Amino acid sequence: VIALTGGELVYFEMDPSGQLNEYTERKEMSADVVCMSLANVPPGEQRSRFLAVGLVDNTVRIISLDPSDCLQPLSMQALPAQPESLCIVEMGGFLY
Amino acid sequence: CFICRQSFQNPVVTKCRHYFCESCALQHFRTTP
């Protein structure tokens, strides 16, 4: 998932036997972006991740981009000033 | 709602049953965390 000036935008995936493609479903999100981050699971013949975006306003946002319920925000936020960074990780033997 | 006493403009929740309107509770967090 990459952005441009704007926001919630293009995925630009690939083909599992071939080359790249895209989704033309965009939200375009009045701008508000400082950071985005995600993480991917060791299984997954599907999308199989979660989106977290950080906004210029005092807000972050997590969006599940599974094809059912795509570009639809899932749960909300609170932060005091500005994030400038995000990360998703799993560390045990809950996605932190 | 019952902070702004409006209609339920995204009546959305916190940890502990507190359903507030969305941008109004964002402004509430701007008031007190």
UniProtKB/Swiss-Prot annotation, chain A:
It is found in: Nucleus. It comes from the Eukaryota. Component of the 17S U2 SnRNP complex of the spliceosome, a large ribonucleoprotein complex that removes introns from transcribed pre-mRNAs. The 17S U2 SnRNP complex (1) directly participates in early spliceosome assembly and (2) mediates recognition of the intron branch site during pre-mRNA splicing by promoting the selection of the pre-mRNA branch-site adenosine, the nucleophile for the first step of splicing. Belongs to the RSE1 family. Component of the 17S U2 SnRNP complex, a ribonucleoprotein complex that contains small nuclear RNA (snRNA) U2 and a number of specific proteins. Part of the SF3B subcomplex of the 17S U2 SnRNP complex. SF3B associates with the splicing subcomplex SF3A and a 12S RNA unit to form the U2 small nuclear ribonucleoproteins complex (U2 snRNP). Within the SF3B subcomplex, interacts directly with SF3B1 (via HEAT domain), SF3B5 and PHF5A. Identified in the spliceosome A complex; remains associated with the spliceosome throughout the splicing process. Component of the spliceosome B complex. The core of the protein consists of three beta-propeller domains. This is Splicing factor 3B subunit 3. It comes from Homo sapiens. The lineage of its organism: Eukaryota, Metazoa, Chordata, Craniata, Vertebrata. The chain holds residues 555 to 664 of 1217 of the full protein.
Swiss-Prot record, chain B:
Changing residue 3 to A: Strongly reduced E3 ubiquitin ligase activity. Ubiquitous. Changing residue 1 to A: Loss of E3 ubiquitin ligase activity. Component of pre-catalytic and catalytic spliceosome complexes. Interacts (via N-terminus) with the spliceosome subunit SNRNP200/BRR2. Component of the minor spliceosome, which splices U12-type introns. Within this complex, interacts with SCNM1 and CRIPT. It is linked to Trichothiodystrophy 5, non-photosensitive: An X-linked form of trichothiodystrophy, a disease characterized by sulfur-deficient brittle hair and multisystem variable abnormalities. The spectrum of clinical features varies from mild disease with only hair involvement to severe disease with cutaneous, neurologic and profound developmental defects. Ichthyosis, intellectual and developmental disabilities, decreased fertility, abnormal characteristics at birth, ocular abnormalities, short stature, and infections are common manifestations. Required for pre-mRNA splicing as component of the spliceosome. As a component of the minor spliceosome, involved in the splicing of U12-type introns in pre-mRNAs. E3 ubiquitin-protein ligase that catalyzes the transfer of ubiquitin onto target proteins. Catalyzes polyubiquitination of SNRNP200/BRR2 with non-canonical 'Lys-63'-linked polyubiquitin chains. Plays a role in DNA repair via its role in the synthesis of 'Lys-63'-linked polyubiquitin chains that recruit ALKBH3 and the ASCC complex to sites of DNA damage by alkylating agents. This is E3 ubiquitin-protein ligase RNF113A. It comes from Homo sapiens (Human). The lineage of its organism: Eukaryota, Metazoa, Chordata, Craniata, Vertebrata. The chain holds residues 262 to 294 of 343 of the full protein.
